[PDB]
Amino acid sequence: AYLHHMQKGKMIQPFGCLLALDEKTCKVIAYSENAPEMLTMVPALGIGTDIKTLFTAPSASALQKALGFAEVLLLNPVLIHCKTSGKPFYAIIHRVTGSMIIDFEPVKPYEVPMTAAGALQSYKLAAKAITRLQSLPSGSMERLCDTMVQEVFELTGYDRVMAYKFHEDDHGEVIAEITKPGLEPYLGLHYPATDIPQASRFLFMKNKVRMIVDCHAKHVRVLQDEKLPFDLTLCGSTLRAPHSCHAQYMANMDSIASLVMAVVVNDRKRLWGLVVCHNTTPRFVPFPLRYACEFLAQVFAIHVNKEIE
Amino acid sequence: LHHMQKGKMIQPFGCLLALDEKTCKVIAYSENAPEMLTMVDHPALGIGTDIKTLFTAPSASALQKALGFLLLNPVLIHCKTSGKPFYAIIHRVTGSMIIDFEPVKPYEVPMTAAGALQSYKLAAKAITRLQSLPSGSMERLCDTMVQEVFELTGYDRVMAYKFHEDDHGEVIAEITKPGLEPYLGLHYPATDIPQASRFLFMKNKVRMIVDCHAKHVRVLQDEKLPFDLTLCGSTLRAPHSCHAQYMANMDSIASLVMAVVVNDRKRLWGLVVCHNTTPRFVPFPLRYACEFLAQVFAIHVNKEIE
Ligand SMILES: *[C@H](C)[C@H]1/C(=C/c2[nH]c(/C=C3N=C(/C=C4\NC(=O)C(CC)=C4C)C(C)=C\3CCC(=O)O)c(CCC(=O)O)c2C)NC(=O)[C@@H]1C
Ligand SMILES: *[C@H](C)[C@H]1/C(=C/c2[nH]c(/C=C3N=C(/C=C4\NC(=O)C(CC)=C4C)C(C)=C\3CCC(=O)O)c(CCC(=O)O)c2C)NC(=O)[C@@H]1C
């Protein structure tokens, strides 16, 4: 049941908007319902729209040029400007067979001159983290995980950061934790397997970093071309809305916002666990920082697998 | 020392402005800056020009904020009429804020963040390969460093150049494109690298020369400025004429040099030296990534001695 509704991914979070394009025609074959408002000035946006009508000439050309690379050759994000408004967005591209799917995340105008500076700064901080993991003496899973949650806490600014390990019966245990002062600790607690369905663990193998900005936000529908006789697969989107059971789960534990990083060993390939960030209030972090976190989690996974041996 | 610090020439691949640390107005500029930044009241660019007349408002605001600091480089700026974009690289000296401007292709502006992330990722992967090395073999450590830099930077030749106790140098590792003659193993006199150059490398850890044959450009300053403006910290500083000549005879038209400073007790261990047969330019984000790679390399060198 869970996998169907997560794979189709027809509901997104409202912090961004989504377009899907036909690789052959470059025209819009699906869009989220908030996309006309975000990207135009309400020359419309609908099924069949050409993207050269929406963005400035260098922007349209950069996206058009992405159509011609293999996915492993995609460099994200792309900085685009809207043609009428001048509004800037980060465009995050991925491919599913003959479709190109694009997530658009807003950028503040005063942030634009700092886009390269901020990207370098995020990766530099992550790189300094990697050196401290590596400097650590071997022999203690506990010290390794403490160092990791401490580094992530400083890098990401969330109220709570946990290392969550899966046991062989698939139930989980919180084995390391750092929080801001007032909060209730979860260190040492065990949780049922069913708190994280099989389908979610499966998706984490491919989508290694997941952000939920606000569990109470009103989700937005994706509309697709009525001519299509199948559903598009949108689960690779950075914007996919959380299933309502989990959004209800979040509100109950006063984690209004979250950032989760998969820890995949032998990347025998196995989901060892998760690094779980919670925030009491809504929180957004831009793509370059999440991208750096993905690499930090990869290196962490190498050290985890070393200690096992 | 006094025609590297008080020498007033830059390489022509970019241009330079210096601004007064209080008024924010132009107190020095390279002779190529008017055509590069305005396309040639008053001559649009001279002593006393206000940066609000040169750049779009978001661009000028971002530079005003930097004068208020802490520095994250580079800043992406657009010129006011042309919309012509540059990377602005900022540093401070006692009297002034100095800005090096390196051009960006207008149609590449959408990919600036993407390219910066990719540069740092490749350097971060190189860092993990150095770390995973079994300790004990200085040869293996240095061979790995030159291989990674070669792949990252795309230069024709990459060598590790070690300083001996008498300050003479030795090439102890090297990788080149096929068919180039090796220099591995050669010893060179201490005088090839004067002490003044060594002292600069302590502060400016990455130095790029795009084309030893390029015609250098003068920096003009107000003659009543109560101090002498130094260019030691500019990414654009011209090579000394002895070295421009030294490079031509050895068919290194372009170079990229990384200092290797241990106990960063502080001493210059050596250099990672990249050479190219033809002119070569690499953008600031890649040089910035190389700086961190060089610091991490220095730590492993220091470990090997001990
Ligand atoms: C509804 C009947 C059942 C249900 C479904 C469900 N859960 C998830 C996803 C996650 N569940 C967790 C669990 C935890 N988070 C924590 O912080 C802790 C320790 C305090 C636990 C145990 C996590 C981390 C996830 C991943 C969330 C993410 O991707 O950010 C899903 C998938 C949701 C989606 O839309 O991707 C579903 C469907 N949960 C229940 O408890 C019910 C039994
Ligand atoms: C002129 C009278 C003397 C002189 C001066 C001089 N040298 C440098 C700087 C450098 N010299 C070297 C030397 C080498 N490069 C190599 O590739 C090799 C081995 C194959 C050697 C021995 C290097 C690497 C530098 C640094 C250059 C840089 O910053 O990119 C300077 C500094 C130039 C400047 O303006 O910074 C000067 C003045 N060289 C001679 O040979 C004379 C004896």
Numbering used by the authors:
A (entry chain B): 69 to 110, 121 to 345, 360 to 401
B (entry chain A): 71 to 110, 119 to 147, 151 to 345, 360 to 401
What did the published study say regarding this structure?
Phytochromes are biliprotein photoreceptors widespread amongst microorganisms and ubiquitous in plants where they control developmental processes as diverse as germination, stem elongation and floral induction through the photoconversion of inactive Pr to the Pfr signalling state. The principal role of phyA is to detect exceedingly low light levels by integrating photons over prolonged periods, whereby molecules in the inactive Pr state are converted to and accumulate as the Pfr signalling state in the nucleus (the very low fluence response or VLFR). Here we present several novel 3D structures of a minimal soybean phyA(nPAS-GAF) construct as Pr and Pfr.
On the same basis, however, penetration of omnidirectional light into the thin, plate-like microcrystals would be adequate. In order to collect diffraction data for Pfr at the XFEL, we thus irradiated the sample in the capillary that feeds the slurry to the jetting nozzle with a 630 nm LED array, allowing ~ 45 s for dark relaxation to the final photoproduct before the sample arrived at the X-ray focal spot. Paying particular regard to the Y242 rotamer, the Pfr occupancy was estimated to be ~ 11% and ~ 23% for the A- and B-protomers, respectively. It is unclear why the occupancies of the chains differ. The largest electron density differences are associated with the chromophore region of chain B, consistent with the higher Pfr occupancy there. From the distance difference matrices, specifically chain A shows a slight general shift of the nPAS domain, whereas chain B shows slight shifts of residues K78-V110. Both chains show shifts corresponding to helices Q276-K286 and H321-D332 (blue and red stripes in Fig. 2b, respectively).
